Scaffold this active site. Sequence first.
Site, PDB file in Angstrom:
ATOM      1  N   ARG F   4       0.805  -1.221   0.000  1.00  0.00           N
ATOM      2  CA  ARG F   4       0.000   0.000   0.000  1.00  0.00           C
ATOM      3  C   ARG F   4       0.844   1.280   0.000  1.00  0.00           C
ATOM      4  O   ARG F   4       1.672   1.464   0.909  1.00  0.00           O
ATOM      5  CB  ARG F   4      -0.928   0.032   1.218  1.00  0.00           C
ATOM      6  CG  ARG F   4      -1.714   1.336   1.320  1.00  0.00           C
ATOM      7  CD  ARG F   4      -2.627   1.408   2.520  1.00  0.00           C
ATOM      8  NE  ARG F   4      -3.187   2.749   2.643  1.00  0.00           N
ATOM      9  CZ  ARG F   4      -4.315   3.158   2.078  1.00  0.00           C
ATOM     10  NH1 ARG F   4      -5.033   2.319   1.341  1.00  0.00           N
ATOM     11  NH2 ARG F   4      -4.714   4.418   2.249  1.00  0.00           N
ATOM     12  N   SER F  58      -7.477  -0.238   1.986  1.00  0.00           N
ATOM     13  CA  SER F  58      -7.141  -1.011   0.792  1.00  0.00           C
ATOM     14  C   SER F  58      -5.655  -1.256   0.566  1.00  0.00           C
ATOM     15  O   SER F  58      -4.814  -0.483   1.021  1.00  0.00           O
ATOM     16  CB  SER F  58      -7.742  -0.341  -0.441  1.00  0.00           C
ATOM     17  OG  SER F  58      -7.598  -1.176  -1.569  1.00  0.00           O
ATOM     18  N   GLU F 107      -8.620  -3.319 -10.557  1.00  0.00           N
ATOM     19  CA  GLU F 107      -7.647  -2.945  -9.541  1.00  0.00           C
ATOM     20  C   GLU F 107      -7.191  -4.091  -8.619  1.00  0.00           C
ATOM     21  O   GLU F 107      -6.051  -4.087  -8.138  1.00  0.00           O
ATOM     22  CB  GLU F 107      -8.143  -1.725  -8.776  1.00  0.00           C
ATOM     23  CG  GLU F 107      -7.862  -0.434  -9.550  1.00  0.00           C
ATOM     24  CD  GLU F 107      -8.865   0.672  -9.272  1.00  0.00           C
ATOM     25  OE1 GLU F 107      -9.457   0.682  -8.169  1.00  0.00           O
ATOM     26  OE2 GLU F 107      -9.071   1.534 -10.162  1.00  0.00           O
ATOM     27  N   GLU F 109      -8.054  -5.211  -5.455  1.00  0.00           N
ATOM     28  CA  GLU F 109      -7.689  -4.819  -4.112  1.00  0.00           C
ATOM     29  C   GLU F 109      -8.020  -5.879  -3.068  1.00  0.00           C
ATOM     30  O   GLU F 109      -8.851  -6.755  -3.288  1.00  0.00           O
ATOM     31  CB  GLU F 109      -8.394  -3.511  -3.770  1.00  0.00           C
ATOM     32  CG  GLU F 109      -8.219  -2.444  -4.835  1.00  0.00           C
ATOM     33  CD  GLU F 109      -9.003  -1.169  -4.555  1.00  0.00           C
ATOM     34  OE1 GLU F 109      -9.873  -1.153  -3.651  1.00  0.00           O
ATOM     35  OE2 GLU F 109      -8.753  -0.168  -5.254  1.00  0.00           O
TER      36      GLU F 109
END
Lengths: 103, 103, 103, 103, 103, 226
Positions: F4, F58, F107, F109
């Site tokens: 992240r 996330s 994405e 996530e």
Amino acid sequence: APQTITELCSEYRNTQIYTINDKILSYTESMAGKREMVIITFKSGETFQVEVPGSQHIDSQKKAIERMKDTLRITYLTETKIDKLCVWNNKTPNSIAAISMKN
Amino acid sequence: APQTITELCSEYRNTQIYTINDKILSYTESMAGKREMVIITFKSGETFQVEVPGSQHIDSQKKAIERMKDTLRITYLTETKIDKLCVWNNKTPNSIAAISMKN
Amino acid sequence: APQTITELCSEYRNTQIYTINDKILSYTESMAGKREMVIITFKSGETFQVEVPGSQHIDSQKKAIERMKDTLRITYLTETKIDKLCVWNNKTPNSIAAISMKN
Amino acid sequence: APQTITELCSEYRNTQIYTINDKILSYTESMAGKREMVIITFKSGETFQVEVPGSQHIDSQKKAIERMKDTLRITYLTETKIDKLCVWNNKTPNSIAAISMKN
Amino acid sequence: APQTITELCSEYRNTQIYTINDKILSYTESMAGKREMVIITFKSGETFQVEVPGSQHIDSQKKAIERMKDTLRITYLTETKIDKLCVWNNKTPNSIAAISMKN
Amino acid sequence: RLYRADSRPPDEIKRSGGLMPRGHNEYFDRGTQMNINLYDHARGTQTGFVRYDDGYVSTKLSLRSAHLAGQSILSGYSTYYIYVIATAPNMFNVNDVLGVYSPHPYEQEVSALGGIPYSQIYGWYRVNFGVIDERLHRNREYRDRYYRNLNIAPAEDGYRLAGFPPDHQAWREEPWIHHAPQGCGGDTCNEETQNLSTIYLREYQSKVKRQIFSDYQSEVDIYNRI
Ligand SMILES: OC[C@H]1O[C@@H](O[C@H]2[C@H](O)[C@@H](O)[C@H](O)O[C@@H]2CO)[C@H](O)[C@@H](O)[C@H]1O
Ligand SMILES: OC[C@H]1O[C@@H](O[C@H]2[C@H](O)[C@@H](O)[C@H](O)O[C@@H]2CO)[C@H](O)[C@@H](O)[C@H]1O
Ligand SMILES: OC[C@H]1O[C@@H](O[C@H]2[C@H](O)[C@@H](O)[C@H](O)O[C@@H]2CO)[C@H](O)[C@@H](O)[C@H]1O
Ligand SMILES: OC[C@H]1O[C@@H](O[C@H]2[C@H](O)[C@@H](O)[C@H](O)O[C@@H]2CO)[C@H](O)[C@@H](O)[C@H]1O
Ligand SMILES: OC[C@H]1O[C@@H](O[C@H]2[C@H](O)[C@@H](O)[C@H](O)O[C@@H]2CO)[C@H](O)[C@@H](O)[C@H]1O
């Protein structure tokens, strides 16, 4: 036996309940002769002590004085919130008789 | 009774306050005969000891010495910051009398 | 008093300093009669013990022996690196006299 | 002195080694009269006890018994895997003599 | 010996099992004379105590009362769920005889 | 490992007890209780921050992807970090739990319910002027033994936490139908998602306290005190 700290606090003379609802700011421990005690403070300014064992203590409290110091150290290190404190107010700093915490 | 470590420290002859404000760098514990003690050092190079119990220790200090070694081990392992130390400077390394921690 | 484990170790016969610089691999504890002891090992193959209390231990060591086993248990659980060990080499496995940890 | 839990275990009668390699599933502690003890169980089904101090225990074992209960409580809380157990199998539940942990 | 808290509980008069399956809501500790005890409560509304040591406690229970108190403090601090409690129902609040935890 | 990009530096993350969701000061703070909902979190984008609203934080499946996201969102920071996180059951793969209703599927996530405790963060890299300093700084308080063997929570445990609104078709179909909160598929549905999410979080937080608070437990010589 009592069921809450308030109720237990009420059976003794010279006591008072403090609602702290906060974690300990500082912890002081001392092994100096005649000053074998613990002192804690809160950001509110309050300062309390666990007294040096003496004549005001009956034998059964000796083991409890040690437990209380154990509890305050771990409570300080874990940043655990203290709810209330029952203290004897005829001592400076005020002397801890009971403590309670709630989640 | 004292309300801070400085105030407690001042009640003794041959003491001095060290402002550490750092975590312990090394911890040494020994169970070797006649040298059952603990030694801690900091990044500053300062070194301190918890003395071997002796005749300079009053009976009430014996339980407080064991508690201090317990506290130093915990603090070392968890990298807890020590604020100040009250030491007897007439010993080498300086002997620990009280410790304070904050926040 | 000594300021480092190496100084402390040098004051005894049949001792040696081992530079470990690693965490404990295995921890063994026994409450079996006559074998109340702790054994630890490291990845490099070294094995050490904290001896069953006996005639070679003076009164002051009794407490330090218990403290050393507490230290080895918590050190194992937290995976803390041990820097050096001072041990008596006239016992098998070698017996722990002092322990040092840093950072 | 023995160098491993298996060596140590075999020095006694009515003992057996159990390879657990799992954490404690349940922990039961009792302060009831004549039943001051700890009982642990594993997912595999086995149940073991630290027995109540008795005439079958030598004095040096009194303190080791307390240490073992401390160890069992903290390994249960930390969910630490137990490798092997050496137990007396002439008791129901089987009685703990030594414990080993490795990572 | 018993293999479960229920089995052990049934060996005593004036006891009963409470299935809590919940963390301790509040923890109260007192070092006041004649009231050296701990009181815990649950969200359910139930309050339990670890009694002040007395004549109803046999010698072997003294060490167990202390251990129980250490256990309740760490269980409270970690928010670990208590499964069942074996309590004496002839005391107010009900007195803790045994505790069990799982997972 | 999960990754992240985040402008909040190591010592702040340390002060907070971990990487927190929008508006959560400390990890164990029960006072300023946050709203938790996976569907809401997964849809709401942020400026200056990689998705961290609605009780979840996330993370991406790789350093490169974490980097790309950082460049798009944190483009004007002379410095920022990419935290390397261990897998554990507080993490849910957004694509798996929301299935075909996953808003930003590409994405990929993996979100952490309630934030990411400091002890679950392995280390971090610093990013200077958008360039990654390839030296991984390791966290001293990472619990290797504990996190060594843990993994993301399987999708089956997340279905009931999906957070879809009460009349959302998903509550009438496999496999969400078999896990719908009381009153889903009336505010109650919503109030139930918050209740269940808070329960799961509270149980995970207990596991973390069992690890970190146990370091302070000091054993007593009972016979000597007795
Ligand atoms: O026990 C600690 C507490 O003692 C109070 O003194 C009491 C004492 O406990 C009691 O046994 C005796 O009968 O009366 C004393 C009061 O006159 C202290 O007053 C209090 O400050 C604490 O130190
Ligand atoms: O208490 C530890 C401390 O003792 C000092 O010695 C004192 C002793 O405590 C006291 O009982 C006596 O009356 O006076 C002694 C003066 O020598 C040491 O001076 C100090 O370094 C520690 O060892
Ligand atoms: O103290 C543990 C250590 O003791 C050695 O034995 C000593 C003994 O303690 C002492 O009283 C005597 O005068 O000399 C002995 C030999 O130096 C053991 O040899 C050593 O292995 C440890 O067990
Ligand atoms: O030490 C616990 C262990 O004791 C065995 O019993 C033995 C004891 O080991 C020793 O003092 C001697 O052999 O006689 C005792 C019987 O009075 C138990 O059999 C074993 O189950 C453990 O309880
Ligand atoms: O041990 C705590 C427990 O004691 C009960 O008292 C029992 C006592 O344990 C036993 O030795 C005696 O012979 O009978 C008593 C019952 O009349 C208490 O009743 C119970 O409440 C606890 O305090």
